[PDB]
Amino acid sequence: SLLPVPYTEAASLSTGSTVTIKGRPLACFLNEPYLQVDFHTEMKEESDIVFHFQVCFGRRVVMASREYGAWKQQVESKNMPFQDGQEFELSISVLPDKYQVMVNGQSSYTFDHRIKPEAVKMVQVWRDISLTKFNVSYLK
Amino acid sequence: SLLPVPYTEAASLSTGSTVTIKGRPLACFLNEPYLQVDFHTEMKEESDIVFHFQVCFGRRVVMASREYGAWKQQVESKNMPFQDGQEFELSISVLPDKYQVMVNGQSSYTFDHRIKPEAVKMVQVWRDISLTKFNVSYLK
């Protein structure tokens, strides 16, 4: 669809920021398409990842960070609010102590800050989706 | 690059057929891009899969079949001939008893036929790659 995927955008985040994403999986859930959102410390795709969010649609969600090149402390969730064949709206809010992921208006995942969100310089959205909206708030 | 991804092409296979694919991963290996090739029994993406081939670049390869909607007998390989950042050439030959996967000219994976390859009607190539060539032989 409309936006290029992998989608890369320079970004700054602090408490009160929201990243909003609207997209659709490229395959039915039986084929297990993926979605990934990574908040990076630099514009280079190989830079460290403050917040890694990976959906295997219809199956599970994994969250982690990547620090000095190494994956740290993967956590896993079976919560699966995404619907087979449907467009989704994903919202990632930066709270004082954690990221909160809303899916279609419903709180679905949280991830405690391991690194200050001020370290984020870039967000990348990729894998098996099409993308029609990506927005970061810059109000505060 | 040149071909659309997910790439879908109707196909027929028998002993002596070769499927040739040329492409490049969309991300460095540190980001673990995927490649998937599925030989389907019908044109519908939710149809059964005679041969499922999924690379997690730099990590592992999984092979399976999907029969009446259910994944059957996943096998796993740590063989990883693909090179970080490089274009690859993948060849899948239909032998009498198995598929043989060549990577950059080197025999790398084999998968015994669980279903006659005559059941194949469609090949799909997808996930985190760009694609410049896809070819099936029809000589025999």
From Swiss-Prot, chains A, B:
Gene behind the chain: CLC
Organism: Homo sapiens
Source organism superkingdom: Eukaryota
Protein name, entry field: Galectin-10
Subcellular location: Cytoplasm, Cytosol; Cytoplasmic granule
GO BP terms: regulation of activated T cell proliferation; regulation of T cell anergy; regulation of T cell cytokine production; T cell apoptotic process
Single Gene Ontology MF annotation: identical protein binding
Sorted UniProt keywords: Acetylation, Cytoplasm, Lectin
Other information: Forms hexagonal bipyramidal crystals, known as Charcot-Leyden crystals, in tissues and secretions from sites of eosinophil-associated inflammation and some myeloid leukemias.
